[PDB]
Structure formats: structure tokens, C-alpha cells
Structure 1
Amino acid sequence: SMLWVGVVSIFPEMFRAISDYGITSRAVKQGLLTLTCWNPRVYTEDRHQTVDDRPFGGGPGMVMKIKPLEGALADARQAAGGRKAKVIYLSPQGRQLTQAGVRELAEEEALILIAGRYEGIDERFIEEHVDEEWSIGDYVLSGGELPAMVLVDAVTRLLPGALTDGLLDCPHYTRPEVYADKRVPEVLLSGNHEHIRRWRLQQALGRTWERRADLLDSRSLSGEEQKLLAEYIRQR
């Protein structure tokens, strides 16, 4: 198994969305990717022992207790075997996920994802056990299970046999050639690899320029790209 993922969450059954459907589901079946869950609720001491507890200094909500989390993590570590396991906390405070970050995480042999809820986990747990913190975007969600599934989905795509340049994609077209008085660009219907690849490159450069110009400030444009972009802008 290329990659081994352990998810630490109080809602293990939410993760059926990725284990039972899509490319992630396929990866589990193909033996390419191992996906396990570790509910911290079961690593408490008794039954009156809640996974969470009230926050110090008052305030609303609950905070996740260090001990259950430590139990779930130690267990997942053990199950990972001799694999080099990176521990990620899914957090709004984390480094924004980008395809570059996904490529970095894809190089890992084992990943242990911590998905906490709205009133978060105890700081000492993070300080002691977490390696990296990641956010999926600058918007507020009510927990880290959807961001954990987003991370697992993005990474799985890069696993060999499961299936970018800093540019948006070109438009896609499929049958019929004419639909509701709209025709597929002739270059795609009638054209050689060099026409199509230059057209695709120009549409990709053009759409990026139009919608996400910031992705161009970071990137340096080639001779062909600058020409194809100028040509696109002037032929709008």
C-alpha cells in the first residue's frame, strides 16, 4: 500500500464519503491506499470519561482532552507499523493547502490526520504531537472532517495508478459538435497536435489572465506564452 492514512475524528462514519465513493474508494480496493479511523471517544479512561471537556477560563463550547487524543494517536502510530508517519492537524490557523503542498504530502508513506471540532483541541497536544497544521481556505467550517477528506482526495489523485503548471485549465468539449446553436472550436474538430496544444495553452493562459491574474505575478511567462497571451487579450 503506497500510502497509509489514519484519521483521528469523533465521527469516523463521515469518512464513508471517501472510502465508499470516487477515486479514493477505488484506491482502497486497488490496494493502493489504506484508510483507517481512530475515534478518540474509545481512548478515554472510563465511560463518564468524555472525549472533550469544559474550557479553562470559562467560555462557551468544549475543548478536546489531551489523553483521548494521545491514546488514538499512539494506537494509529502502532498500526502504521514501521512507516514514517507525519501528523497533520486540520486547522483554520494552518498553512493554506495548494497543489505544491499536496505534492509534498503525497511523498509521505504514512499520514495521521487530526480533525477537531468547533472549539478545538488543547494547545499542549498540538505543541507536543502535531508536525504540520493545514487549512483548506479562508472560510469558516464547523469542523475538520470535510477538510480531512479534501486532503485525502487531493493526495490520492497523485498516487501512481490511481488516475498544476500554475495555470487554470482550457475549456473542455464533448459530443455533439453543435448544441443549442453553439459549436465546438474548429481547431479541436479539425487540427493537428501543434494547433490544439497552442490553442489549449492560449485558452489556459487567457482564462488565468482573466480570472486569476495573481497566479501570473508569481509565474514567469515564456516567449510563446507572452505572445499567445497578448494575442488572446487583443482577440477578445
Structure 2
Amino acid sequence: QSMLWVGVVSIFPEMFRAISDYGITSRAVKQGLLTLTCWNPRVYTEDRHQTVDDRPFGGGPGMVMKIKPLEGALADARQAAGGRKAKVIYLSPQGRQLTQAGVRELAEEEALILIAGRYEGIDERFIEEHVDEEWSIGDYVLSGGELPAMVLVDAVTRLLPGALDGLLDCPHYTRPEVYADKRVPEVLLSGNHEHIRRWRLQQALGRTWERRADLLDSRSLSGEEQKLLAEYIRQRD
């Protein structure tokens, strides 16, 4: 049926309209490249206002997500994935940092179940028991895992065949040619493909070196790349 099956465990399934109703994610859902389902732990509660948080053992601020509701939603999602190999990922700052390399890897999966936490987190025993991998979108703290989940799905969905390198991007220009006495680089106005390719590559290399030299220390460069970057540096004020 679909290339990527995603099940999201979240108490705010309504938030995932941002990727289901918009962009390539929406387009992939309609094309059937991407199957997106939501599983509200709040529905697998058996009480008052469908409470899914409790007070933490040992005290402290905040609340913790109870096991029982989470258990429900995850069991349902696992069933819903069928005979697909589903990786269960918890979105948390304690997880492995998401990078483009990590995204390419994640795009090879046939099914993902994403747990979005709220409050202080979920019970460590749930994680021990049910979670295959922990992923972080960066070294900052968000109020929940819904946005991280959606970030992950967006990045991964981009790489799916028929949806649409360690360098930063070149600058981009479009109409008009001149705007408030700021003209577009001449090289992009000459129809020459080879000059344009060389200039963009060099600008990419230059910006990478200027702002993210760490990306250059990981990736070894081609001979042409070394020359173009050298020329960039030596010809800059």
C-alpha cells in the first residue's frame, strides 16, 4: 500500500493537521506515499476527564505521563501497523541528535510509531519496555513532543521517492533583476551552466567555512572544492 506508515501517540492529535493538511507531507498522504494515523492516550483512559498524567514519585515539580494510557495507544498503533516492521521512537532531549544522516536512515523504515510526551516525560519503565530508539531534534526543551515528531516526519517524508551533502546552501535570487539598487549576481543572468554551477558551489563552500567550519572538518573536499574555497577566502575583504 504506502511506503511509510507513521503512527503518532499524542494527546493533541489535532496538532498534526500542520503536516496532514500542508506541504509535501499532505501531498504524500494524498498520493499514498505516507500513511499518517494518531492515537490519543486520553482515549485509552478509564476515568473522569481522561487523565493521563500523575504526580512523580520522589516529588519534584510537574507531572509524569502514566503508563496505562500510553500502553493502550501504543498497542492499538502496533496492531494498526499490521505485519510492517515498526520502529518505536520516543521524542526526547535525552535522545540521539537528529541530523540529515539520521533522517536518511529513518527514511528506510516501513513503519514508525512516534511517542510524543508531555509534562516532565513518560515513565522510565515504559521507555525501558516499549521504546526502540530515542531521538532529539535539538538541545532545547519544548513543552511536548508533537512538534519534534512533525519535524522528524517532514524531514523524512522529503526523501521518500517521488515526493519532491554536508554543505550549507548558496544564496538564492529571483525577480526582479534589480531591487532598490541591489542587483542579482551577473553570473546567474548569463545563461552559462558551468560558471553558474561553479559559483554556487563556491558560495556554498564559502558560507559553510564562514559559519559552520565543523561541517568542513567532517567532510573531506574535492580538489576543485579546495581551489574554489581557497579562492573565496583570499578574495574576500
- TM-score, scaled to structure 1: 0.96
The whole-number CA distance in structure 2 between the counterparts of 1:206 and 1:5 is 38
Over aligned residues, Cα RMSD in angstroms?
Answer: 1.2
Q: Distance in 1 between matches of 2:72 and 2:140?
A: 31
Q: CA deviation at 1:46?
A: 3.8
**In structure 1, the residue corresponding to 2:225 is in which secondary structure?**
helix
CA distance in 1, matches of 2:136, 2:81: 24
Which residue does 1:120 correspond to in 2? Answer: 121
| Partner Cα separation in structure 1 for residue 169 and residue 129 of structure 2 | 41
3-state SS of 2:48 partner? coil
Runs of 5+ consecutive residues of structure 1 not aligned to the other structure? none
1:178 paired residue number: 178
For residues 94 and 4 of structure 2, the distance between their equivalents in structure 1, rounded to whole angstroms, comes to 26
SS at match of 2:91: strand
Could you give the per-residue CA deviations for residues 124-162 of structure 1, whole angstroms, max 9, x where no partner exists? 000011011011111121111111110111111111111
The aligned runs of 1:125-140 (5 Å cut-off) are 125-140=126-141
Report the counterpart of residue 207 of structure 2 in structure 1. Answer: 207
Q: Deviations over 1:94-149 (max 9, x none)?
A: 11100000101100000000000131000000001101101111112111111111
**Residue correspondences, number:** 235
1:23 Cα deviation after fit: 1.2
Deviates more, 1:225-234 or 1:54-63: 54-63
Structure 1, residues 166-216: CA drift from partner, whole Å, max 9, x if none?
000111111111111111111111142211111111000001001111111
- Output the CA distance in 1 between the equivalents of 2:180 and 2:142: 39
| Deviation for aligned residue 1:75 | 0.4
C-alpha distance in 2, partners of 1:217/1:49? 51
The answer as to whether partners of 2:43 and 2:50 remain within 8 angstroms in 1 is no
SS in 2 for 1:183: coil
Give the whole-Å Cα distance in 2 for the aligned partners of 1:65 and 1:130: 15
Cα distance between partner residues in 2 of 1:78 and 1:12: 18
Rounded to whole Å, the distance in 1 between the matches of 2:170 and 2:59 is 53
Please name the residue that 2:190 is paired with.
190
**Given the superposition, is the C-alpha separation of residues 26 and 121 from structure 1 closer, same or farther in structure 2, using an over 3 Å criterion?**
same
Task: Single out whichever of 39-48 and 220-229 deviates more from structure 2.
Answer: 39-48
Structure 1 segments of 4+ aligned residues over 3 angstroms from their partners:
45-49
Once structures 1 and 2 are overlaid, which stretch shifts more, 42-51 or 27-36? 42-51
Task: Note the C-alpha offset of 1:60.
Answer: 2.0
- Which residue number in structure 2 is paired with residue 46 of structure 1? 47
Shift in Å, 1:35: 0.6
